[PDB]
Amino acid sequence: AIQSQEKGTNQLDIGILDTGTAIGTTQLEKRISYRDRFTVPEVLMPQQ
Amino acid sequence: AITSVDSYLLSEIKPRLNTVLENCYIIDEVLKDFDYQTRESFKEAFCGKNAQHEVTVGFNFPKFKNNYEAHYLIQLGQGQETKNSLGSIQSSYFEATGDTLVESSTAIREDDKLVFTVSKPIGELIKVEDIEFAKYDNLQVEGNKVSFKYQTNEDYENYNANIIFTEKKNDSKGLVKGFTVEEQVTVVGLSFNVDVARCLDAVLKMILISMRDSIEEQQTFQLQNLSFGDIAPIIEDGDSMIFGRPTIIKYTSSLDLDYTITQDINKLTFKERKD
């Protein structure tokens, strides 16, 4: 499960940057670790 | 001649950086002091003609996303006026002159003279490579081409010379009014890998060293000084930090404007008086 998904944009001298918070909730017995990675094939995101 | 330091920096950096990254020998010479690991990783990533990864350079505040694997970032910085001349006078010219050009030109035979052709007319001839024309050669410039006596020099009919000269714009004359400006420009390399940033900074230093032989900054942007900042995390809000080490470059240039003169004396009216 995933919630609060945010595409926070910061415009800076280096350029634009995409960073935001998304809150997720797992199943039982699963022990996630720091800097684990997830990918959602179903959901597509537009970029230019 | 108003000076745009940023554009000059970009134009000098891009082809020179590409050429430096083209070959491995120069890069190995540059990165002699670095360890094997970082040196070889950078060479694998960026060095070579067939490199898959590539660096980029551009100005600050681009509305588009900018590649943060390896990039050179420029911003204009401060400026100050340091020295002035009397009446703000810098120089006087009889013929309007533009930029200083260097052109290769093979010698040619003309019925009385050996000559070199050039792309554009000549306002003033500074130097011909490895030549010191004497009175006998009677060096003369006639618009596009420069010429010297055929007979005693006939061994050199195809001399592969090159020429440093100046463009001609107009026959008018005027005064140069302006001052000197001491300007600071900031350059920083960006990379999420700190070692890549270090190597990028070293390459930047080398190309700055190499630039000092360039005609334009030899004539326009003397007194180059450098200053380096500390390695700092540029951004922390991403999934991974951006690391960069800003560098400050200083230059001295003469902002000036040509003030034309329409007064030309060609007659004299020396007459006495009576009482």
Q: How many CB pairs under 8 A join A and B?
A: 36
- Resolution for this experimental structure (Å): 4.3
Answer yes or no: are the C-beta atoms of B198 and B38 closer than 8 Å.
yes
Cβ–Cβ < 8 Å for B273, B108: no
Method: cryo-EM
Contact at CB, B63 and A16, closer than 8 angstroms: yes
Tell me whether residues B235 and A13 touch, CB distance under 8 A: no
Concatenating the DSSP letter of every residue in B14-42 gives: HHHHHHHHH-HHHHHHHTSSS-HHHHHHH
CA distance B247 to chain A (A): 15
Contact flag B238-A14 (C-beta cutoff 8 Å): no
DSSP code string of B132-143:
---TTT--EEET
Do residues B92 and B176 touch, judged by C-beta distance below 8 A? yes
What angle, rounded to 10 degrees, do the helices at B5-22 and B194-211 form?
110
Identify the sign of the CA torsion A31, A34, A37, A38. positive
For residue B212, the 8-state DSSP code is T
- Could you write out the DSSP letters of every residue in B94-151? SSEEEEEEEEE---EE-SSEEEE--SS--SEEEEETT----TTT--EEETTEEEEESG
Scan for tokens 């404007």, then name that residue: B257
Q: Checking DSSP bridges between strand B56-59 and strand B71-75, what pairing results, if any? A: parallel
Asked if B209 contacts B200 with a C-beta cutoff of 8 angstroms, the reply is no
Q: Cα A6 vs. chain centroid, distance in angstroms? A: 8
Beta bridge partners of A37: none
Strand partners, B145: B142
What letter would DSSP give residue A42? S
- To 10 degrees, the CA torsion angle through B42, B45, B50, B55? -90
Strand partners, B115: B108, B147
With an 8 Å Cβ cutoff, is B240 touching chain A? no
Residues A17 and B60: their CA atoms lie apart, in Å, by: 14
Please check whether residue B117 is in contact with residue B108, taking contact to mean a CB–CB distance below 8 angstroms. yes
- Considering only the beta carbons, identify the residue of B64, B75, B237 that sits closest to A15: B64
Name the token pair of B7. Answer: 């554009």
| b/e map B169-188, b = 16+ CB within 10 Å | eeeebbbbbbebbbbbbbbb
